[PDB]
Amino acid sequence: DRSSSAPNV
Amino acid sequence: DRSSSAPNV
Amino acid sequence: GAMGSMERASLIQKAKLAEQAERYEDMAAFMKGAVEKGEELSCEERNLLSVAYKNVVGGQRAAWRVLSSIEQKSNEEGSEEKGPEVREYREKVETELQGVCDTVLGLLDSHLIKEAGDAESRVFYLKMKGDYYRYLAEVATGDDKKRIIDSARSAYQEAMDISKKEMPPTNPIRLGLALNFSVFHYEIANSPEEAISLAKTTFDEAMADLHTLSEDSYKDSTLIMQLLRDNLTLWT
Amino acid sequence: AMGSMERASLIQKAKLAEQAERYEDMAAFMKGAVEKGEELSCEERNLLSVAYKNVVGGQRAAWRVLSSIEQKSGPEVREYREKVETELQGVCDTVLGLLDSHLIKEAGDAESRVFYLKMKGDYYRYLAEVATGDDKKRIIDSARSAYQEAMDISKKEMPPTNPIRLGLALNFSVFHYEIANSPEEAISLAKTTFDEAMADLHTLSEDSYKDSTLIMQLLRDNLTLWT
Numbered sequence: 001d002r003s004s005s006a007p008n009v
Numbered sequence: 010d011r012s013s014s015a016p017n018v
Numbered sequence: 019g020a021m022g023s024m025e026r027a028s029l030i031q032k033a034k035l036a037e038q039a040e041r042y043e044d045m046a047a048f049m050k051g052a053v054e055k056g057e058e059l060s061c062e063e064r065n066l067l068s069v070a071y072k073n074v075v076g077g078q079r080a081a082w083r084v085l086s087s088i089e090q091k092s093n094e095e096g097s098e099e100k101g102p103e104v105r106e107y108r109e110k111v112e113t114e115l116q117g118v119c120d121t122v123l124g125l126l127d128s129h130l131i132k133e134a135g136d137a138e139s140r141v142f143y144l145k146m147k148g149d150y151y152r153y154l155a156e157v158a159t160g161d162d163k164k165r166i167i168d169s170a171r172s173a174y175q176e177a178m179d180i181s182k183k184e185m186p187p188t189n190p191i192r193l194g195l196a197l198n199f200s201v202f203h204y205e206i207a208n209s210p211e212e213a214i215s216l217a218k219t220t221f222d223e224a225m226a227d228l229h230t231l232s233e234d235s236y237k238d239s240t241l242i243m244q245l246l247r248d249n250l251t252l253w254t
Numbered sequence: 255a256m257g258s259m260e261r262a263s264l265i266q267k268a269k270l271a272e273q274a275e276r277y278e279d280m281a282a283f284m285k286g287a288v289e290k291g292e293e294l295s296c297e298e299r300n301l302l303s304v305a306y307k308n309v310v311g312g313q314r315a316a317w318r319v320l321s322s323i324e325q326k327s328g329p330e331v332r333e334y335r336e337k338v339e340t341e342l343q344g345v346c347d348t349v350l351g352l353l354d355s356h357l358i359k360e361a362g363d364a365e366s367r368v369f370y371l372k373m374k375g376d377y378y379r380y381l382a383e384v385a386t387g388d389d390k391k392r393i394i395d396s397a398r399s400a401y402q403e404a405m406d407i408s409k410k411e412m413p414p415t416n417p418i419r420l421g422l423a424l425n426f427s428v429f430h431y432e433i434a435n436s437p438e439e440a441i442s443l444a445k446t447t448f449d450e451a452m453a454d455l456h457t458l459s460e461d462s463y464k465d466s467t468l469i470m471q472l473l474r475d476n477l478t479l480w481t
């Protein structure tokens with residue numbers, strides 16, 4: 001997988 | 010609630 | 019840029035790439051370029067053309083419906099302040115939607131309908147003409163509305179007449195046409211009786227010949243028949 | 255046309271566009287709002303962020319699909335990948351342009367300063383994802399510098415469980431891992447961020463609890479992936 005970055009809140 | 014038309018195959 | 023000078027094969031390939039990238043606006047632009055090379059489209063290529071524009075106009079229709087709902091909720095609340103912004107933005111989205119519809123109808127008229135050989139391709143394109151006039155009808159309000167509805171009906175009826183003469187009752191395109199014409203009757207032309215009668219007849223005649231239907235079209239045709247049934251349940 | 259619209263109308267239209275899932279429109283409305291020259295509130299910064307994140311997000315997804323096909327491999331896929339890439343770079347340049355010309359200032363609260371510097375880091379990071387030249391090195395340095403400045407402010411001015419501080423730290427850790435080939439720093443930053451945040455979680459206001467716990471979960475998910 002790719003790393004997760006900050007999502008839309 | 011809308012009727013269903015043909016979808017993408 | 020400048021698709022007129024591009025190889026037809028390259029435009030088709032780029033449409034397939036755009037599909038994989040879920041870039042439907044690009045996909046539609048590539049297929050428009052391919053049509054403008056002036057050769058007929060195969061069944062596969064007609065599918066690419068259809069998927070591309072259906073996804074583009076589909077997103078616009080969804081957005082229009084959201085905005086129209088907000089607009090009417092605002093208006094009926096009748097508050098002294100809110101309403102102009104949502105109206106303006108609904109109008110903007112509507113104008114873009116009409117532009118895509120006009121592009122498709124333009125292609126059908128200038129390149130695809132006249133030049134189609136076989137019945138299958140003729141029915142497909144006449145169905146598509148019906149569909150994009152129907153999408154125009156969804157947002158039409160003037161006296162232009164009546165004319166748009168008549169254009170949709172005329173396209174669908176011509177397609178129906180050919181499909182009945184030239185195509186088996188279980189043919190996917192014939193079925194897809196019949197489904198969409200029934201939706202036109204119900205949702206656009208305020209003719210629920212005709213909608214139900216067409217859908218019911220289409221379903222029964224398809225089911226009667228289902229044992230003859232080839233395995234290659236089985237999935238598509240049974241899906242349409244299920245939607246006929248789903249609509250019939252909704253409408254009755 | 256945006257210049258002639260009132261600021262309040264642009265904000266309203268951005269909210270309408272959000273509801274319609276029309277993110278390109280939403281971004282254009284928020285760009286117009288920024289260009290009115292007044293500061294953005296927390297809520298308005300969210301609108302700006304969501305709009306451009308969704309636009310560039312779609313382009314990044316498409317670029318990855320095309321780049322994958324290209325690497326498996328006529329000129330078509332290369333050409334089309336280049337086209338999508340150029341559009342993605344255009345959106346990044348627009349955002350970085352707005353940050354530089356209007357949003358990043360010496361003044362205003364730490365939260366807004368950190369937010370905009372984080373965003374600068376993010377959009378240089380997106381440029382870095384597709385960069386290949388010597389421009390790549392410069393782009394990476396620009397991302398790092400933006401993130402580092404944001405980190406320095408956040409450490410001095412903001413609690414460890416603050417959502418923006420956390421979001422910054424998460425994205426900087428991703429930069430370390432995915433861009434700068436620094437897994438040790440990525441893991442160490444993520445681990446330290448998580449522990450320090452959890453240690454102070456009992457002091458965090460309830461209005462930030464959901465956002466902060468989401469970021470902390472992503473820190474944990476990344477840590478599990480990276481180790």
Ligand SMILES: *CC(=O)N1CC[C@@]2(CCN(S(=O)(=O)c3ccc(Br)c(F)c3)C2)C1
Nearest residue numbers: 015016018061064065068190191194238
């Ligand atoms: C052979 C040919 O010209 N085709 C096959 C597929 C398509 C594009 C979509 N249709 S349709 O609109 O007639 C249709 C859509 C969905 C389904 Br399940 C269906 F059976 C037909 C014709 C172009």
Ligand SMILES: *CC(=O)N1CC[C@@]2(CCN(S(=O)(=O)c3ccc(Br)c(F)c3)C2)C1
Nearest residue numbers: 006007009296299300303417418421465
């Ligand atoms: C108050 C303020 O300026 N805000 C609140 C939301 C946002 C928009 C994007 N972030 S973020 O990138 O710092 C972030 C994203 C997701 C999550 Br769950 C989070 F906690 C922070 C700040 C602008």
Ligand SMILES: [Cl-]
Nearest residue numbers: 106107110267
């Ligand atoms: Cl507008």
Ligand SMILES: [Cl-]
Nearest residue numbers: 032333334337
């Ligand atoms: Cl291209």
Ligand SMILES: [Mg+2]
Nearest residue numbers: 024025026027
């Ligand atoms: Mg050629």
Ligand SMILES: [Mg+2]
Nearest residue numbers: 096097098099
């Ligand atoms: Mg009121």
Ligand SMILES: [Mg+2]
Nearest residue numbers: 112157158159
């Ligand atoms: Mg109108």
Ligand SMILES: [Mg+2]
Nearest residue numbers: 258259260261
């Ligand atoms: Mg003004």
Ligand SMILES: [Mg+2]
Nearest residue numbers: 336339340384
């Ligand atoms: Mg390039």
